Ligand binder design. Structure first.
Ligand SMILES: *[C@@H]1O[C@H](CO)[C@@H](O[C@@H]2O[C@H](CO)[C@@H](O[C@@H]3O[C@H](CO[C@@H]4O[C@H](CO)[C@@H](O)[C@H](O)[C@@H]4O)[C@@H](O)[C@H](O[C@@H]4O[C@H](CO)[C@@H](O[C@@H]5O[C@H](CO)[C@@H](O)[C@H](O)[C@@H]5O)[C@H](O)[C@@H]4O)[C@@H]3O)[C@H](O)[C@H]2NC(C)=O)[C@H](O)[C@H]1NC(C)=O
Ligand SMILES: *[C@@H]1O[C@H](CO)[C@@H](O[C@@H]2O[C@H](CO)[C@@H](O[C@@H]3O[C@H](CO)[C@@H](O)[C@H](O[C@@H]4O[C@H](CO)[C@@H](O)[C@H](O)[C@@H]4O)[C@@H]3O)[C@H](O)[C@H]2NC(C)=O)[C@H](O)[C@H]1NC(C)=O
Ligand SMILES: *[C@@H]1O[C@H](CO)[C@@H](O[C@@H]2O[C@H](CO)[C@@H](O)[C@H](O)[C@H]2NC(C)=O)[C@H](O)[C@H]1NC(C)=O
Ligand SMILES: *[C@@H]1O[C@H](CO)[C@@H](O)[C@H](O)[C@H]1NC(C)=O
Ligand SMILES: *[C@@H]1O[C@H](CO)[C@@H](O)[C@H](O)[C@H]1NC(C)=O
Ligand SMILES: *[C@@H]1O[C@H](CO)[C@@H](O)[C@H](O)[C@H]1NC(C)=O
Lengths: 57, 522, 531, 57
């Protein structure tokens, strides 16, 4: 699983909340994913993450 | 019925921050499930110890199956036989019904996969995965097409296996319904090699006998085991009497299924089961009924609230969709299109602009609030909101109401009498107060619906401040400090507020022990 | 492709049997498709021609053959019996789509018969009939002997049974002869995959929906469909009904883009009447705001027992038939053939109930005879007969046959939307031959029959003719308010020559005068102070 | 083709407009039907016959 960086034009705006942008090409097709910072999730890490480990009331 | 229906996920190839939470989510979603309505996407399972026994009862997937970054040694779909591919997964050209990438599993076992009705099969970058080349996908893929090397040494298929195998053993041999047939039935699938042993043209995958009552799955409509061109109409026209009679044997159409009642996430409308209701039609009791007079203004929901779409909710009495209010709602954010092309930047907006939702009475999806702003304190903008239908739910905990990491001090949305078909998750709101004391089952429709109230502001710190429920509310709780904010009232209820006796507040006649009413008394 | 209307008298006959034969010959001659039941009864004499059977291809109701003694009954071209109306001996017993009984024919030959879509087949007490025992009815019917005569074996050619003696009479097979992959339909070959679309009835000459002999449900664009192309088309992928530009209305086994106009439109179909949930509003069956306005169902025959239901009705859904028995009264019969309650004679004075009636959705039939039943002023406020249901092979929207009527008096009758006028053998009725009926009928294709009523010369000598104020369109009665169209001026449904006569009349238009405001005597115009 | 008299109740009251009731037993069941007087047709002889010989106007 070796990943390379996404364009610096693209990096600045795309990923949100200090998320790391990383790109993987599959059969020469550049697919851009977005590694989230702790406590954030989403396609661009735009939503906050909910803890599902608590017991229900 | 339909045994057990699931809703699939749309969030594709998206990496989760916490792997334990993500596993817990997939386990909750797919356990006991037989029929997944939507895409079944199995992403980022890095631990080999993880138990994938939630896939155990899955038999049919209406959408696509995506398996990405799964590192479990053996991925097994014991009962899956059909992938419909009504929606297909493709990257930013080729479109897939089954797609497997960057996964480190040694074996992917779908021993009973008979038919992939639409789209292609694709494998990419799976280094330990094996046997996939022994499969011969022309048999499984509907079109009749050859669809898309390992590092390890791979065990030969079991001797029983005539051509191919999904894994080790005789129960992993690939079964054949299409290719092992007599030419005497071109355009169909046989249960045996002899010329009479062909199957009904309605069948999909396999079949036991020659009739449409004998198919494994239906290429058209499936009505309680039988395949038919069309679903028995709820209203059938009478050629002799020239009248559109009501059909006693009528059923509603739900995808390629024929059903008597309809799944809670859909509304029945004119013999079919639709997610949204027509412009000239009213939602009432889970059925699209004609609205008496002008139809209540129904506008669509939005994925994220911003300056570009806030105006579109003006005068809306029903919101068909979800509302997400995030930090981005107030901060403004840089949008994007699926093209990967930069979208518009939305001008930051302040909470006062949220008074647009004042006319709103119903939200058909979920209400989600994770936004923080100094002035965004209560949630009184939805003071006329009556019900949140859980027709669509959040991906985690099946939440219909999720208030997470918001800068709220109180809810303040009275009139909210019912959250039907969802769970409520209220967690980590540093200054949110009343949530701890509201007993949410009172609002919720079914006791099986769950609530999670964790990490908010202490109930004791709320007491010390005095921000508690008025001495007029019962044990059910309240939405805020006010006298009009009680869930239910232990004494008399007058107008929107609650008094001790109808003697107070001058003229008011008591036509109930629980209620009083205003005069022009007795 | 001629249509003819079937009878439903069962074993009943005219006393004159030669007349009864000539009645059948008139009805079914050159007929292709009989709508209703074909009842071939009481042909007691051999050598009757029976040629009217030659062209019959389809019968929607049942076929009943009773008391026919012609040696050889042939249906040369009959291929399907739909059995949408079925024949019964008692309510509890089997219902038949084909039933022959008490008949003296040597052979009943229906070669080419492929399908009996609904109902059973029955043979009882016919002494010379043969080869019916050799026929496999499991092949013809979807679900459901001892002739005391030496009967010829089927021709050597026939592999199974036969209808008669020829090689042409061998029973042909398209259902039991099939592969099993076709349960529910008929094959055009013995191979699996050589089966015809489930959408069609009778046989078929290939797999597609166009290669069908008869159309099971709907015929559209020369292709058989189970359901007419929906106005709102369902999408299985995204669960939503989309609006269909190709949508067509269901119109009795045909699929049309627009309804006939005299019919209502229920969401998918051209209809006669809306169900209790919905109501007429424009062209459509729109659902009611609050309450739905009391519907007023038509009766099979009007009598003293049912007349009360019509009180205070505006639209009669169904039809109105006032027959001889209406006035004379009669015993009713329950459906289980035990005698019901007797109805008292109806007094014509009681028809005043219909004075509130404005529309009739079916047809109007007046055949009743009574000394005091002289006119039809009970329907004076009746303005339209829609004709969504017609009467007899004449296709009548208004039928006045052998009534005791002297005049019509239906002042407001402006329109007959569909179907014909037939008025005959009313010995005392005037006006009817002088009424220009095309004026009232919606389309010029609609026909009129006016015969054998009181002769125009004899009405003239009596002076029971139109006013001088009616134009060439005729009139419903003698009075000034009975003109179809006013020759000159019209004042409160009355035809006048000059508005100056009525004092209180002012000239509103070139063909209208209106009554003055309650205030004063004579006005120069239309208003309170205008005097 | 044998034909018998209807039960009193049917004989008197079944057939209208001066018709005559006759009864046949077919499949051991009594079927009551009638001979209509000139100008009538239908099961109980209730409908008046219409002449089809005349041409339309
Ligand atoms: C009247 O109403 C007012 C306004 O609503 C109330 O004031 C609010 O009071 C709450 C509760 O105390 C307070 O929130 C807490 O803030 C503290 C400290 O402040 C932060 O300090 C952090 C580190 O030094 C820093 O990151 C921030 O910038 C703040 O300055 C905070 O520790 C609490 O946060 C915790 O939430 C954690 C998340 O799960 C939990 O984590 C634990 O932390 C423990 C201590 O570090 C540790 O021992 C545990 O192992 C565990 O990890 C834990 O549950 C804590 O709750 C709170 O968030 C609000 O800031 C404050 N609001 C305002 C506007 O001032 C007031 O209390 C009320 N009544 C009275 C009588 O005062
Ligand atoms: C004034 O108004 C009188 C009442 O309406 C009217 O009298 C009727 O006149 C008709 C025609 O003459 C009478 O009907 C005939 O009755 C005789 C008696 O048995 C029949 O022979 C005759 O047979 C028929 O003739 C028809 C006419 O062509 C034809 O349709 C048939 O085929 C058949 O052959 C008629 O049925 C009727 O009884 C009279 N009614 C009454 C109540 O007296 C007057 O003629 C009329 N004019 C004058 C100048 O008085
Ligand atoms: C039409 O016939 C009706 C009866 O069917 C007549 O109305 C009645 O006429 C008799 C006169 O002999 C009176 O005894 C009744 O009181 C009348 N009743 C009503 C409701 O009017 C009527 O005279 C005839 N009209 C025309 C224009 O000929
Ligand atoms: C609700 O919020 C608004 C704006 O933040 C504020 O002015 C008002 O005082 C709040 N109401 C209550 C009852 O807290
Ligand atoms: C149909 O029969 C009529 C007489 O009823 C005859 O005049 C005509 O020739 C026939 N039509 C055809 C097309 O043979
Ligand atoms: C059928 O006939 C019986 C008498 O045998 C009678 O009591 C009953 O009312 C009839 N059935 C109906 C449904 O009216």
């Amino acid at each position: 699983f070796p990943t390379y960086k996404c364009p610096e034009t693209f990096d600045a705006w795309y990923c949100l909340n200090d998320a790391h942008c990383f790109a993987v090409k599959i059969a020469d097709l550049p697919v851009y994913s977005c590694e989230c910072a702790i406590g954030f999730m989403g396609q661009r890490c735009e939503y906050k993450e909910i803890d599902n480990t608590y017991l229900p009331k | 019925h339909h045994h057990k229906i699931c809703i699939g996920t749309k969030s594709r190839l998206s990496v989760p921050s916490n792997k334990e939470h993500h596993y817990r989510n997939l386990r909750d979603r797919y356990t006991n499930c037989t029929y997944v309505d939507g895409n079944l996407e199995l992403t980022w399972l890095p631990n080999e110890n993880l138990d994938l026994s939630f896939l155990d009862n899955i038999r049919e997937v209406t959408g696509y199956i995506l398996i990405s970054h799964v590192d479990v040694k053996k991925v097994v779909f014991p009962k899956l036989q059909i992938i419909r591919g009504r929606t297909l997964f493709s990257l930013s050209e080729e479109k897939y019904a089954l797609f497997v990438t960057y996964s480190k599993m040694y074996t992917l076992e779908i021993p009973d996969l008979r038919d992939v009705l639409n789209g292609q099969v694709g494998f990419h970058n799976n280094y330990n995965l094996c046997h996939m080349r022994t499969i011969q996908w022309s048999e499984i893929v509907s079109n009749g097409t050859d669809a898309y090397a390992p590092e390890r040494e791979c065990p030969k298929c079991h001797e029983s296996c005539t051509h191919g195998c999904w894994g080790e053993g005789p129960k992993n041999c690939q079964k054949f319904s299409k290719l092992t047939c007599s030419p005497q039935c071109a355009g169909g699938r046989c249960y045996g090699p002899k010329p009479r042993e062909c199957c009904h043209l309605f069948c999909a995958g396999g079949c036991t006998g020659p009739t449409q009552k004998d198919c494994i799955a239906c290429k058209n409509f499936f009505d309680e085991g039988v395949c038919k061109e069309e679903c028995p109409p709820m209203r059938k026209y009478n050629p002799t009497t020239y009248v559109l009679e009501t059909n006693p044997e009528g059923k509603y159409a739900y995808g390629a299924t024929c059903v008597k009642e309809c799944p809670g996430h859909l509304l029945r409308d004119n013999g079919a089961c639709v997610r949204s209701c027509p412009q000239d039609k009213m939602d009432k009791g889970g059925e699209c009924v004609p609205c008496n007079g002008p139809c209540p203004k129904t506008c669509p929901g939005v994925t994220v609230l911003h300056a570009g779409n806030i105006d579109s909710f003006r005068n809306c009495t029903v919101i068909d969709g979800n509302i997400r209010i995030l930090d981005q709602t107030f901060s403004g954010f840089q949008d994007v299109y699926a093209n990967y092309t930069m979208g518009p930047r939305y001008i930051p907006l302040d909470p006062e602009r949220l008074e647009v939702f004042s006319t709103v009475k119903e939200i058909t999806g979920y209400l989600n609030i994770e936004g923080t702003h100094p002035q965004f304190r209560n949630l009184s903008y939805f003071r006329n909101l009556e019900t949140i239908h859980g027709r669509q739910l959040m991906e985690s905990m099946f939440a219909a109401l999720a208030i997470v990491k918001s800068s709220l001090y109180s809810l303040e949305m009275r009139n909210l009498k019912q959250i039907s078909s969802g769970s409520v998750v209220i967690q980590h709101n540093r200054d949110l107060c009343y949530v701890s004391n509201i007993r949410w089952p009172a609002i919720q429709k079914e006791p099986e619906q769950k609530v999670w109230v964790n990490e908010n502001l202490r109930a004791d710190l709320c007491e010390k401040n005095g921000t508690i429920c008025s001495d007029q509310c019962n044990e059910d709780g309240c939405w805020g400090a006010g006298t009009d904010q009680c869930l239910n009232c232990k004494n008399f209820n007058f107008n929107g507020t609650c008094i001790a006796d109808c003697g107070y507040i001058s003229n008011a006649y008591k036509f109930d022990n629980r209620t009083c009413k205003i005069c022009h008394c007795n």
